[PDB]
Amino acid sequence: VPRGSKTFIIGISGVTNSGKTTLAKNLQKHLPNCSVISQDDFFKPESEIETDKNGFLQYDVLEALNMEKMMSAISCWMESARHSVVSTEEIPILIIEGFLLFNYKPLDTIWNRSYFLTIPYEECKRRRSTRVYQPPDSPGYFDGHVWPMYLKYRQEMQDITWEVVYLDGTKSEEDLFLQVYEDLIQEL
Numbered sequence: 001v002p003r004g005s006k007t008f009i010i011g012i013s014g015v016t017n018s019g020k021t022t023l024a025k026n027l028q029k030h031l032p033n034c035s036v037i038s039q040d041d042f043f044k045p046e047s048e049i050e051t052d053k054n055g056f057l058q059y060d061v062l063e064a065l066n067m068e069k070m071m072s073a074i075s076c077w078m079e080s081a082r083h084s085v086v087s088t089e090e091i092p093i094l095i096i097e098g099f100l101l102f103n104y105k106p107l108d109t110i111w112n113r114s115y116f117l118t119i120p121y122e123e124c125k126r127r128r129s130t131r132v133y134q135p136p137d138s139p140g141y142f143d144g145h146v147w148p149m150y151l152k153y154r155q156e157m158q159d160i161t162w163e164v165v166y167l168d169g170t171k172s173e174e175d176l177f178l179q180v181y182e183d184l185i186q187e188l
Ligand SMILES: NC(=O)c1ccc[n+]([C@@H]2O[C@H](COP(=O)(O)O)[C@@H](O)[C@H]2O)c1
Pocket: 015, 016, 017, 020, 021, 040, 041, 043, 059, 060, 098, 099, 133, 134, 135, 146
């Protein structure tokens, strides 16, 4: 059986501002031959984003994202992964991280492991206000768009077809890194 075509793909989703991107990065520096793709790199330009009845920019839905572009990026990684180990098993690793991964049906069978970072409403709001997006959050954007769209995502995930490990995002960076690392090494 020829080597080189196997991969191990990890999804890290979760609410906005829950430490997803930092978790991906901490895992990557402790894992061999590991890449990270970030869903936020595939948002459409603000000019292509729709606006709802109350004037809120619609960013927190899959329509805001070029998911075909993101698939193409995943495909590029897979082709590179095939040549990452010289012939003479060492299985290349991809971490895909973003707030809206587990409702996207074309990727439903891609995940070898799945983690979902959670933080409650008040702490999520507080964290979100310390961060600057481009475009910036409008007044009342968290309540008017971000949180309702998050709750919509969680209901969409009620009929998911694979196991998800839910994580407490109020834990420290190191705590979260160790928990996931401890689980991950057993799956690899
Ligand atoms: N990256 C962008 O171009 C952009 C623009 C406006 C809002 N956002 C926000 O990014 C959030 C998702 O990213 P995080 O999970 O890193 O918070 C969404 O909740 C969305 O409101 C991103």
